[PDB]
Write a protein that binds this DNA or RNA. Sequence first.
DNA 1: GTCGG
DNA 2: GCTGATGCGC
DNA 3: CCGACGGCGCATCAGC
Length: 315
Amino acid sequence: TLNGGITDMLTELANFEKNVSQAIHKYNAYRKAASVIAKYPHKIKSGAEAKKLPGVGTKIAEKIDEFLATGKLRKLEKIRQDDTSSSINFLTRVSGIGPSAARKFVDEGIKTLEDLRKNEDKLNHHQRIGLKYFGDFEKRIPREEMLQMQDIVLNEVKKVDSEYIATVCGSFRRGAESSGDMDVLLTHPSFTSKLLHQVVEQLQKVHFITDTLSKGETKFMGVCQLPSKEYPHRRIDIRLIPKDQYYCGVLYFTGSDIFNKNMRAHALEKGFTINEYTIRPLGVTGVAGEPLPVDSEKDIFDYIQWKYREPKDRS
DNA sequence: GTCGG
DNA sequence: GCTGATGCGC
DNA sequence: CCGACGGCGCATCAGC
Ligand SMILES: *CC[C@H](OP(*)(=O)O)[C@H](O)COP(=O)(O)O
Ligand code: NA
Ligand code: NA
Ligand code: NA
Ligand code: NA
């Protein structure tokens, strides 16, 4: 919008770092720079101005000056026209193809979705499924559809055992109007520090779950589809969490990221440490004590004298 | 790439 | 066969 | 100057 050229430039740079250079820390630096500039409510006039924002340093400032002066970045123009770099970058759009698989494919002349179709022998299961649903997996999921999906999974987990607790988390639980995927956290009173299998099996039985990317005892990653134009196929994760770790898990997997940083910060200065699993009292010498009993995500907040924030208000 | 000890 | 490392997604 | 930057759960690879 105001700085869309800058934010587009930093996201392209991020993708190049992640996918081609395999520099995950440069990827995360450009993304951080991109999101603080996305939030700046003025049209940036100089790199010097942008540098004042946290996450923008000397190099992104220089890049912004080149972009504003010339309307482009020489290096990105060059990366963009590079056949090998552009193809490596592009293949990572397939779920299961990371930077390592995308380079391997481009090294053996496999550059396009069309090339992948004709070399399905050289793809693993995840990559094949990623290829099958390439377009569906880049579609966002309207909230209305997420509610129908939630309807089915809460109905079917209650059918296999009414003692299961299932919470859909992620952007969905923060009231977001569209979602990347569906992340379901499941727990059962029998589980504390075959329960997942029976839920996945029931969801396949009623043809909600259509494919499996990965499954073990505590994490399912797969594909689902709303019953019927056919709805797109969607990514669903299901995490089975110890009941005594559940509400910490729900808080962790709801976010947002910046919200949980600020929540970690507070708990620290109040003599408590929160992670994904437990909240723990902090001794006078900084030694974590025993995990504190947690019965609701409100409990966690109570332990650290914060006022409950509604998932709606946590973005 | 940016931050901070 | 196994154990540990690596790739991957989130 | 230089190390941190999230790290878990699963699939598959590398080595024994
Ligand atoms: C944006 C400029 C780069 O910052 P980073 O340490 O990735 C470098 O200064 C120039 O190197 P290159 O763009 O990676 O060749
Ligand atoms: Na800055
Ligand atoms: Na990918
Ligand atoms: Na690569
Ligand atoms: Na859907």
